[PDB]
């Protein structure tokens, strides 16, 4: 028994050892007999009792001592506790009590000692060391006292007020939202101290709410002077020299189909039906790599920006408004430089042939999604008569897009069709309405055309075997998916597969079965929560969500830096023919940092857009205090249950408002069960709620139950 325990501990003490499960230890030790398997489990329990190994709450055994610890990121909570998110995503989260944070703030990379005993369901730990400080600046509301100021942070995860000394005020008055720079971190009993870097304005002034979010996240402000000089010097028309070595497509019937308010027209499309029955699809994308050249002032800024950010009241663009909306934009009935992908597609949606090349186009008409739907779906005779030459092309586009959609779903792609909000604001930035964003035929048509363009480019460059950027979506976390599978089994939905080896078509085989059910929204939602996020990467690792091996972003260079690089690598490798070793090694070095950076800037963006939506959703419900709404239980917890209205506004029913009974949370069933009444409020249940309170600053909406 002891010789085996030593041999396990020595194996785990090897420098190449990573934390492994019982099964991954069984495989690595080549244990095939059932009696040796019993020995291993008995050794693991005995070593874990002695404290020589630690099981993480993802059931992975690691030598603590090489750590006694886990390296990871702090994810703080507004109630003063936190979790460690380990770097190894296979490991579970470690709970950190408020007293054991030891001055670690939200986002800080820390080393956490593991507590041999736990007071709850999860593994506890103490922050022993802070390796990296995440928070240097803090946005908050300044408050004035007699002799000093303090700033109340907008990030509620910062649970302590920032002390502003009398010299660090820098003109900030009572109620001003302010950007503080942290001069000292919290230490012992002392709060953080800081100096007011920037006054944003008063908290009640219009647009300061969104301007506090921009600064919180650290989103990019005004363009640099050299970038705006480059933009102002860029020609408003094409030079005749730039038409050289480009295919002339100005005589073809080419259209843009966008939102009515869209000015940054990235894509233009055509479809011709061939005599054999196959479709030729042209996709013509704005040639931004021409205007924005490598290491230009705009190039350095766009990389820094990483993506365009689309907040409620404004867009922060990646490139200046003179280019994005002017010369890059595929504006109607004017000559525009493009980088095209031209595709012959057969009757099963297979790209038999393709070509990628530089062209010039002149768009026949700028269409809207609304107009294209009214022609196809609503059968509008007035608009058909208006666009009589284009209607036959639109009908061929509809059929082709359906073809491509069928193949996509047959290959086992996951159609995640959720209701998103669109917040509608006025000129002052005050909320008028919160509507559901509906995806029409016209949006699903262009989607399919950008997708088949995006796979086609990605496949082309994979086989060329040159350095390139892909848009990958890795396989879901097996533990998160294992929980999701357990969740849907309560509703009856049994899935064919295991959490380690699920096929994308298996998850769709859920989303179809729940379609037009009450439990749709939440199973949909919890499925998402088990998926990984998509990122950019120089390796073609495939896209799980689209069920494809080859995918990149090619179709939006105005508003995405990874697309603008895809444009450059197209110009470098195909057009210029520069496939030399020195060119490849140059890109092979750069693409990892770019791919990591732009992926960070995307996540930052998405977080910021959401925060502004949740703020304006809360603003919208201020005047609805006392009104009753139908809704659907979107989440249940130990403290209460969240209720989603039809417009996708969410709120909390706190358990204190559930006055009719003592309610116990059932974690397995995701249900609040009354002890006496036997009333059961489950995930997915339709209830009628009333608005009790609304906090705009916190973004909180507080309901009470009227009826089931």
């Amino acid at each position: 028994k002891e010789a085996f325990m030593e041999k396990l501990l020595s194996f785990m003490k090897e420098e190449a050892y990573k934390p492994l499960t019982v099964q991954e230890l069984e495989e690595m030790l080549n244990i095939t007999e059932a009696e040796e398997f019993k020995e291993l489990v008995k050794a693991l329990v005995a070593l874990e009792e002695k404290g020589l190994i630690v099981r993480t709450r993802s059931d992975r055994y690691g030598i603590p001592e090489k750590m006694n610890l886990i390296k990871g990121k702090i994810s703080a909570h507004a109630k003063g506790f936190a979790f460690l998110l380990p770097e190894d995503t296979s490991l579970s989260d470690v709970f950190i009590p408020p007293n054991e944070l030891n001055t670690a703030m939200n986002g800080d990379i820390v080393m956490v000692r593991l507590n041999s005993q736990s007071s709850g369901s999860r593994q506890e730990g103490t922050v022993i060391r802070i390796l990296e400080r995440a928070i240097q600046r803090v946005v908050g509301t300044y408050t004035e006292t007699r002799n000093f100021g303090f700033v109340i942070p907008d990030d509620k995860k910062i649970t302590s007020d920032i002390f502003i000394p009398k010299n660090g005020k820098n003109g900030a008055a009572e109620g001003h939202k302010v950007v503080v720079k942290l001069t000292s971190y919290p230490e012992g009993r002392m709060n953080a101290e800081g100096e007011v870097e920037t006054i944003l304005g008063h908290k009640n002034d219009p647009g300061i709410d969104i301007l506090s979010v921009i600064h919180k996240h650290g989103l990019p402000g005004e363009f640099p002077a050299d970038a705006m000089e480059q933009a102002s010097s860029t020609p408003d028309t094409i030079d005749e020299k730039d038409l050289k070595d480009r295919r002339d497509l100005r005589d073809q019937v080419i259209v843009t189909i966008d939102g009515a308010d869209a000015k940054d027209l990235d894509d233009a499309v055509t479809v011709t039906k061939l005599d054999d029955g196959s479709y030729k699809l042209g996709v013509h994308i704005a040639d931004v790599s021409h205007y924005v050249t490598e290491n230009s002032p705009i190039d350095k800024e766009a990389l820094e920006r990483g993506t365009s950010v689309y907040l409620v009241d404004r867009v922060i663009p990646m490139i200046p408004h003179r280019l994005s909306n002017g010369i890059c934009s595929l504006n109607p009935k004017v000559d525009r430089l493009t980088l095209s992908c031209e595709m012959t597609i057969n009757s099963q949606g297979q790209v038999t042939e393709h070509e990628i090349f530089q062209s010039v186009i002149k768009t026949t008409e700028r269409m809207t999604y609304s107009d294209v739907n009214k022609i196809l779906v609503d059968d509008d005779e007035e608009l058909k008569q208006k666009y009589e030459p284009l209607v036959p092309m639109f009908k061929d586009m509809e059929r082709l897009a359906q073809i491509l959609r069928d193949k996509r779903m047959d290959r086992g792609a996951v159609d995640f069709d959720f209701k998103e909000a669109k917040v509608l604001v006025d000129d002052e930035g005050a909320v008028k309405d919160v509507v559901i964003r509906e995806r029409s035929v016209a949006e699903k048509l262009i989607e399919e055309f950008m997708l088949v363009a995006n796979e086609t480019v990605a496949e082309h460059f994979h086989w060329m075997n040159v350095p390139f950027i892909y848009r990958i979506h890795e396989e879901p976390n097996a533990e998160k998916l294992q929980k999701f599978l357990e969740f849907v089994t309560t509703f009856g939905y049994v899935v064919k597969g295991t959490a380690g080896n699920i096929h994308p078509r298996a998850l769709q085989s859920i989303l179809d079965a729940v379609r037009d059910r009450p439990e749709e929204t939440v199973i949909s939602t919890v499925m998402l929560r088990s998926m990984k996020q998509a990122k950019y990467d120089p390796q073609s690792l495939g896209h799980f969500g689209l069920s494809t091996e080859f995918y990149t972003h090619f179709t939006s260079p105005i508003r995405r830096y990874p697309d603008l690089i895809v444009h450059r690598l197209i110009r470098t490798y195909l057009i210029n023919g520069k496939v030399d070793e020195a060119t490849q090694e140059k890109w092979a070095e750069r693409l990892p940092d770019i791919a990591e950076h732009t992926s960070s800037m995307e996540r930052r963006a998405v977080d910021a857009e959401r925060e502004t939506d949740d703020l304006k959703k809360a603003e919208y419900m201020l005047d609805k205090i006392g009104e009753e709404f139908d809704g659907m239980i979107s989440s249940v917890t130990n403290f209460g249950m969240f209720v989603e209205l039809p417009n996708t506004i969410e709120g909390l029913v706190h358990v204190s408002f559930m006055t009719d009974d003592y309610y116990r949370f059932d974690e397995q069933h995701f249900a609040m069960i009354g002890e006496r009444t036997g009333n059961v409020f489950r995930i997915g249940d339709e209830i009628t709620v009333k608005v009790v309170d609304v906090n705009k600053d916190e973004r909180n909406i507080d309901f009470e139950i009227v009826g089931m």
Binding site: N99, N115, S116, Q117, S119, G188
Partner: protein
């Protein structure tokens, strides 16, 4: 209901250390702060004459080694009898530091208290003696029943 503020002691006039004052007040008997102010200033001259280091370098080192990190607290919920490992608040660390320092210094074999207090500080500073042991003892005991908390 709201944590009473601890009395703000003055700094020790010659070492400018409110820790050293707190030691005096711990050593003081029957309100004879004079006797204890003398004893310490006699004990710290003994430390400086032996070691050559400043008494403050040694005394702070002595406290580090006496000061407890985790303590046993009795919890009897239903049955339990759980000796809950409790982290010693930074004020209670110094408390138990100075309490043990003084309590064991008085128990030592040496004739005078100034020598007894000096030798307990010198032993504490070398990570040895009885007051350091006492911290270990409760930690050994806190490690023994660490299964609770």
């Amino acid at each position: 209901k709201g944590p009473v503020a601890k009395r703000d002691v003055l700094p020790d006039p010659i070492y400018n250390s409110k820790l050293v004052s707190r030691l005096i007040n711990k050593m003081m008997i029957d309100g004879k702060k004079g006797k204890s102010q003398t004893i310490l200033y006699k004990s710290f001259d003994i430390i400086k004459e032996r070691t050559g280091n400043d008494a403050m370098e040694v005394f702070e080192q002595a406290l580090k080694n006496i000061m407890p990190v985790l303590e046993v607290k009795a919890r009897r919920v239903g049955g339990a009898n759980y000796q809950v490992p409790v982290e010693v608040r930074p004020e209670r660390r110094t408390t138990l530091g100075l309490r043990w320092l003084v309590n064991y210094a008085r128990l030592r074999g040496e004739k005078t208290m100034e020598e007894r207090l000096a030798n307990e500080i010198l032993d504490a500073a070398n990570n040895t003696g009885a007051a350091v042991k006492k911290r270990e003892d409760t930690h050994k005991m806190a490690e023994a029943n660490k299964a609770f908390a």
